[model samples]
Target: SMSVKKPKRDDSKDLALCSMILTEMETHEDAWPFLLPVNLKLVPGYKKVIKKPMDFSTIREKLSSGQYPNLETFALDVRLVFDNCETFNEDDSDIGRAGHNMRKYFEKKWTDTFK
Candidate 1:
């Protein structure tokens, strides 16, 4: 049987790259607070403030299911996680400091990998 090469709109490489980035973030110690959705009851008014809540878990599922079309689109959700963190936590506080550190790590990875 002759093997046929299917010309597909391949984004497999992009998916692999995004997945590696996400896994690294998830394992980082600073990733705890951003791993899942903020507890609306624990952190009151979060619902009212963060119009669109994004987190590592959500991003993982979206990426796994191929919801993100490209690396740039994937990057947006990652940034959103940090932006929401800034809105909800004080810069001097624990979670807030972690957010800043994680964001810095992400930006460095982004530049090192793609830029």
Candidate 2:
């Protein structure tokens, strides 16, 4: 993909680090992200927001706080938000390539993670 220069976050290595960081972040997810916990607290412990990028938020709370134990489920949850199946047809244009590469990035992260 030398010819296909697309904006991405490093590679699978970075993606693994990203996974670890997000997992840990989700552990202490109580910390507000401006509109997050303020928003989350409204539900006040409802969970399994499959359409939500951070899946199983309420489920993780029952465990040791700040320690996300579920990686595969988490990744699948993230892939739900990030992965798109139709990027393969993109030309080397900007928006097209951005979608194309990020999907590959997520796929790589998935394989590096789940496989």
Candidate 3:
């Protein structure tokens, strides 16, 4: 007989819950990029929080509560946050590596989530 074990949670290789939320926000025609940063602000540790299974429940709960106060704030935050992150440089650094890992994580998460 063959034995199988569950894989350990790998934060570096997993989509942070916040990423999934942002992705979903991107999907919505009304939500767009503007809403993303604003919502992320509400969840301060979003970069760290969404990577763990322990935080999934909390994340979902927070998202369920709903969006930001207004579209202007949401749009501003989106512009700032995305402007800082959208461009990628092919440099050898921890930040680059982390970005690569995050791309992979989101790709896999999207596949699994949709399937």
Q: Indicate the TM-score of model 2.
A: 0.32
Error of 3 at 50 (Å): 23
What are the clashing pairs of model 2? none
Models ranked on lDDT: 1, 2, 3
lDDT of 2 by residue, 24-109 (tens): 44454232221122244464333434224333344244233534344545455444433321222235555345445554655675
Model 1 Cα lDDT, one tens digit per residue, 9-96: 6565777888899999999999999999888888779999999999999999999997987899999999999999999899999999
Alpha-carbon shift of residue 73 in model 2 (angstroms): 2.2
User: What tens digits encode model 3's per-residue C-alpha lDDT throughout 1-115?
Assistant: 2587677544442334444645664454433223323245565655454332212233334434544343333334333333333343233655445445444544465456443
Query: Each model's TM-score?
Result: 0.88, 0.32, 0.30
Candidate 2 ranges beyond 4 A from true positions: 1-69, 83-96
- Give the runs in model 3 whose Cα sits over 4 Å from its true position: 1-65, 68-90
Model 1 misplacement above 4 A? 1-12
Listing every candidate in turn, what is its Cα RMSD in Å to the true structure after a full C-alpha superposition? 5.9, 13.9, 16.4
Query: Each candidate: how many clashes?
Result: 0, 0, 1
Q: Regarding lDDT, does 1 or 3 come out ahead?
A: 1
Backbone clash pairs in model 3 (N, Cα, C under 3 Å; residues 3+ apart or in different chains), count: 1
